[PDB]
């Protein structure tokens, strides 16, 4: 099970959620076709 692993990182998960919401970060990679070269 992953319950122990999730409970290990619970403070960090909460802090990361708070910071991402504050910064307006969107989870995931919506522009999946992006590439640094960009031709």
């Amino acid at each position: 099970s992953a319950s122990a692993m999730l409970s290990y990182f619970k403070p960090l998960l909460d802090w990361l959620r708070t910071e991402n919401e504050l910064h307006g970060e969107k989870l995931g990679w919506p522009q999946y076709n992006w590439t640094p070269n960009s031709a």
Binding site: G28, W29, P30, Q31, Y32, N33, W34
Partner: protein, 1043 residues
């Protein structure tokens, strides 16, 4: 404990079945293996398990009492009544005389039961299961007679309406039976009876419900009967039996108290049953006024004697069996640890029946019989059954009628009545042997009269068994039926052939009319989107939905595996699943709303410049994506259409996936993709399709390389890379499924103009009416069904606008209006119009061909044959030879240039489509699987587009674009692998038809015109419809059952 024994279902409802009249009726009426087995096992457990210790203690006590009395046993005391030192040996010889009759009857009934219940539950060389026949103890097989009638054409002489029509009382039958008694100078009947006995159901008070006893008041002056009354012939026979018992009671009044029982203990039943034999015969009924005339026919005699032999012969192993087991128990040969063992050994050895379930020493199966707990000897019934035919033969020989023994009543037989009275006078005063000798002529029991009575039916049974060729009985013991999955909750599923057939016919007849009304409403709506036909369409949709739900719930009560048919089983299985009616009402309404929203949003969305002049998908965006050779305009159209349609349907798709998956789960499957794949009835469809795609990969790769080179030569090297995928918007199609529009860019030999002539000169004529007439003319010339004239008198096809605002489709509609099939499509002036016309003509011919099949079996095998049939003839129509014929081009040549140009056009039509057809459903199957989630709907779609088709996005496609939504078939829940299967199948069909029609040489120049053998083989494989699986039609068309 025997009396208050009950069995009830695992649901633990407030009621529990009792032996009478619940369990007996269930075992005599229900032809369900699971329900019969549940009743049998439950009753035997309930009435036997709590009785074992009581019976052991009773056996000990009774043996002690009768050993103190002087007899060695209780069984010896029971045998002492018959007064014979060798009683068991005479009984054994008697049964060994009657064994072949029961063996033939057992084989016949076992064959009939095998035809009924199949081969899984019944062995043609083993014993019959002990619950599938007649009673619970299998003592009498009368209730089996329904399914084992020798000649079912004639009506069985078991009628109650004739009694009611003549105005028979509820008590006058006793009077006419009394006058029948008095006819043979008998019945010195006391006047106390009618004024001191009741023969009627209890009108008031809670007395006994019903029984078959005649309690006598005794007192040497008065007697009585307590028995119900009915209007059946069985009631009349039982009345005659009971009055025979009363007559026996009368004739020994003068004898002392202990000398009241009549000779042998079986003499009572023998005297009661000889008269019943002499009464139930049809000729007595005719001459008494209960029948119009005698049916002096062999078949009626056989039917009557087989009905009589189902109770008077099937009981012979019983009685003998029961008292043999009880004698063994009393003797100590059967200890309490061997009750069930010896019981079932005797049951299989004599009766030839095996327990439906596994039994063991916990059970006491002999205790479910009534006479074991209520301690009454049972050999009296065997003795009486043997004796009654001896008495019948003696009276008949003494009645002066030496003919067949069946129609041999003793009515108006003075001497027979005198002999009967003379025997009846002495009850136990003299040994029974002297009485039997005085009446019959010999002092011992004889089985010869019983054989003589059943001689014609015996000969018939032996002859029929020899013709059917079966073993006489149980050469394969140790066989027990497999459990029917008797974990007791699936016992109420009806598995009857008659009920299934009746349901199938009712479903057919109601479905025909309801589906015709729905088809008419759909035709009215689509032909004219104005005049508010949407309301009628919605009404017909509601009618279809509720009808489908009702009949699917009705068919869910049936079964599939236990059905002993092919067509009925197929229909029941195909009706048991509700495509969308399995959802609850709220979810069903939500699903309908989601589907309608997706379809309307796709059909309405348009993209265009901010100038103001605006374009729709068809025929504006398609035209600007077909005839425009420019990166900017093609990219604008592609991006705009994808934007509009896909971003509109993205907000709807995930909920649609959820709802369709829920419906498929409720229907039995695990996914909507699994439900769609089940249309082909192949458990390994994906592997076969992947194998076919791998087989066809090299040809597509070569064509892709050539088209890529041509596009690079035209557009340049900035937009096209020689190594790398080609952008999806440069192939002359919105979805790049077919690359036919860029043929002028990819012409192999420009100096071979033998295909541009068609559309160049079609302006000279070629009306839609005349071209469809030519198409059906070719259809008929092939050797197929001509089109009914209503297609021209009633139906229309030329509907460019026709006062409606719906984009053009290429569909075919069918309805069982006797003979009516009509189509709709937008008609242009080009060769593709003729190709699609032939495709729709093939659709309509497929509609015609399976006309006589049931409505549920109106499908064309798997839904890939339906599309393949029209394209098969379209392939032969488009050949240059068939274009030169019927004047579709100026001139044709077999040179390499024209042939290569024609093949390139056909390739850009079909090969370019192979990957797309496989890709659409491949993505959709992974979406329904849960493998593709909402976050990467687009990413996996474009991964598939690059992997299979080899195309690249012209612009960066982000998440939230939903490119797959721009395809029409995706926001319409229309499966798409059918086009892959059809494109694979049609070339096999073309090759097989050419081979049957000859045309040795290249396949692409073969023409199916004037091929009677090919047409007849196509018809003989198309007439199957959906009745048989598609490999059979594949085998008939081609010769191999594989794609």
């Amino acid at each position: 404990i025997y009396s208050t024994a009950k069995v009830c279902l695992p649901n633990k409802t407030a009621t529990c079945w009792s032996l009478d009249p619940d369990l007996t009726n269930i075992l005599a009426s229900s032809r369900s293996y699971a329900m019969l087995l549940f009743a049998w096992e439950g009753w035997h457990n309930a009435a036997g398990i709590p009785l074992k210790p009581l019976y052991e203690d009773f056996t000990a006590l009774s043996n002690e009492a009768y050993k103190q009395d002087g007899f060695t046993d209780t069984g010896a005391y029971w045998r002492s009544w018959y007064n014979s030192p060798t009683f068991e040996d005479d009984l054994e010889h008697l049964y060994q005389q009657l064994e072949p009759l029961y063996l033939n009857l057992h084989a016949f009934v076992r064959r009939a039961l095998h035809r009924r219940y199949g081969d899984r539950y019944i062995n043609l060389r083993g014993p019959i299961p002990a619950h599938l026949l007649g009673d619970m103890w299998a003592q009498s097989w009368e209730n089996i007679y329904d399914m084992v009638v020798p000649f079912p054409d004639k009506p069985n002489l078991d009628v109650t309406s004739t009694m009611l029509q003549q105005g028979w009382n509820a008590t006058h039958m006793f009077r006419v039976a009394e006058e029948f008694f008095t006819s043979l100078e008998l019945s010195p009947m006391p006047p106390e009876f009618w004024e001191g006995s009741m023969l009627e159901k209890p009108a008031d008070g809670r007395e006994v419900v019903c029984h078959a006893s005649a309690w006598d008041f005794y007192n040497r002056k008065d007697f009585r009967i307590k028995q119900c009354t009915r209007v059946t012939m069985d009631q009349l026979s039982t009345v005659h039996h009971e009055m025979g018992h009363i007559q026996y009671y009368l004739q020994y009044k003068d004898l002392p108290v202990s000398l009241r029982r009549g000779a042998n203990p079986g003499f009572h039943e023998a005297i009661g049953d000889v008269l019943a034999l002499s009464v139930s015969t049809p000729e007595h009924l005719h001459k008494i006024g209960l029948l119009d005339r005698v049916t002096n026919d062999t078949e009626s005699d056989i039917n009557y004697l087989l009905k009589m032999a189902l109770e008077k012969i099937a009981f012979l192993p019983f009685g003998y069996l029961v008292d043999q087991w009880r004698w063994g128990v009393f003797s100590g040969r059967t200890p309490p640890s061997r009750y069930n063992f010896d019981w079932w050994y005797l049951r299989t050895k004599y009766q030839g029946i095996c327990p439906p379930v596994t039994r063991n020493e916990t059970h006491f199966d002999a205790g479910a019989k009534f006479h074991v707990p209520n301690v009454t000897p049972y050999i009296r019934y065997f003795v009486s059954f043997v004796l009654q035919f001896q008495f019948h033969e003696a009276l008949c020989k003494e009645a002066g009628y030496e003919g067949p023994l069946h129609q041999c009543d003793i009515y108006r037989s003075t001497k027979a009545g005198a002999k009967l009275r003379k025997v009846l006078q002495a009850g136990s005063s003299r040994p029974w042997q002297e009485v039997l000798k005085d009446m019959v002529g010999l002092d011992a029991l004889d089985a010869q009269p019983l054989l003589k009575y059943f001689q014609p039916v015996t000969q018939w049974l032996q002859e029929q068994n020899q013709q059917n060729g079966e073993v006489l009985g149980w050469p394969e013991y140790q066989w027990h039926p497999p459990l029917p999955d008797n974990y007791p909750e699936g016992i109420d599923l009806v598995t009857d052939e008659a009920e299934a057939s009746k349901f199938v016919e009712e479903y057919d007849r109601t479905s025909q009319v309801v589906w015709n009304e729905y088809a008419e409403a759909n035709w009215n709506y689509n032909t004219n989107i104005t005049t508010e036909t949407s309301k009628i369409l919605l009404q017909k949709n509601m009618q279809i939905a509720n009808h489908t739900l009702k009949y699917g719930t009705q068919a869910r009560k049936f079964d599939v595996n236990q059905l002993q048919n092919t067509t009925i089983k197929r229909i029941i299985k195909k009706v048991q699943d509700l495509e969308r009616a399995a959802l609850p009402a709220q979810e069903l309404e939500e699903y309908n709303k989601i589907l309608l929203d997706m379809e309307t949003t796709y059909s309405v969305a348009t993209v265009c410049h901010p100038n103001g002049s605006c374009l729709q998908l068809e025929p504006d965006l398609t035209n600007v994506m077909a005839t425009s050779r420019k990166y900017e305009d093609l990219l604008w159209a592609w991006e705009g259409w994808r934007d509009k349609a896909g971003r509109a349907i993205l907000q709807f798709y995930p909920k649609y996936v959820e709802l369709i998956n829920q419906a498929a789960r409720l229907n039995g499957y695990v996914d909507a993709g699994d439900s769609w794949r089940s249309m082909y009835e192949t458990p390994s469809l994906e592997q076969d399709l992947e194998r076919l795609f791998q087989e066809l990969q090299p040809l597509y790769l070569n064509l892709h390389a050539y088209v890529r080179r041509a596009l690079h030569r035209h557009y340049g090297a900035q937009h096209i890379n020689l190594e790398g995928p080609i952008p999806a918007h440069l192939l002359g199609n919105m979805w790049a499924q077919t690359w036919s529009n860029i043929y002028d860019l990819v012409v192999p030999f420009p100096s071979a103009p033998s295909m541009d002539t068609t559309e160049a000169m079609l302006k000279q004529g070629w009306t839609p009416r005349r071209m469809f007439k030519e198409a059906d003319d070719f259809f008929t010339s092939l050797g197929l069904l001509p089109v009914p004239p209503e297609f021209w008198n009633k139906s229309m096809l030329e509907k460019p606008t026709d006062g409606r605002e719906v984009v053009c489709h290429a569909s075919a509609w069918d309805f069982y209006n006797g003979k009516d099939f009509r189509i709709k499509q937008c008609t242009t002036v080009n060769l593709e119009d003729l190709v699609v016309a032939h495709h729709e003509m093939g659709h309509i011919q497929y509609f015609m061909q399976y006309k006589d099949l049931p409505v549920a079996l109106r499908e064309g095998a798997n839904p890939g044959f339906h599309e393949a049939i029209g394209d098969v003839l379209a392939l032969s129509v488009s050949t240059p030879k068939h274009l030169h014929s019927l004047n579709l081009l100026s001139s044709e040549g077999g040179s390499d240039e024209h042939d290569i140009n024609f093949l390139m056009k056909m390739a850009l039509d079909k090969i370019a489509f192979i990957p797309f057809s496989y890709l659409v459903d491949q993505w959709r199957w992974r979406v329904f699987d849960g493998s593709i989630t909402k976050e990467n709907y687009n990413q996996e779609w474009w991964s598939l587009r690059l992997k299979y088709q080899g195309l690249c996005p012209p612009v960066p496609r982000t998440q939230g674009d939903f490119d797959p939504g721009a395809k029409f078939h995706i926001p319409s829940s229309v499966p798409y692998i059918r086009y892959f299967v059809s494109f694979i199948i049609q070339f096999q069909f073309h090759e097989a038809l050419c081979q049957a029609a000859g045309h040795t040489g290249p396949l692409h120049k073969c023409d199916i015109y004037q091929s009677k053998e090919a047409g007849q083989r196509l018809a003989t494989a198309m007439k199957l419809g959906f009745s048989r699986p598609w490999p059979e039609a594949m085998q008939l068309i081609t010769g191999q059952p594989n794609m």
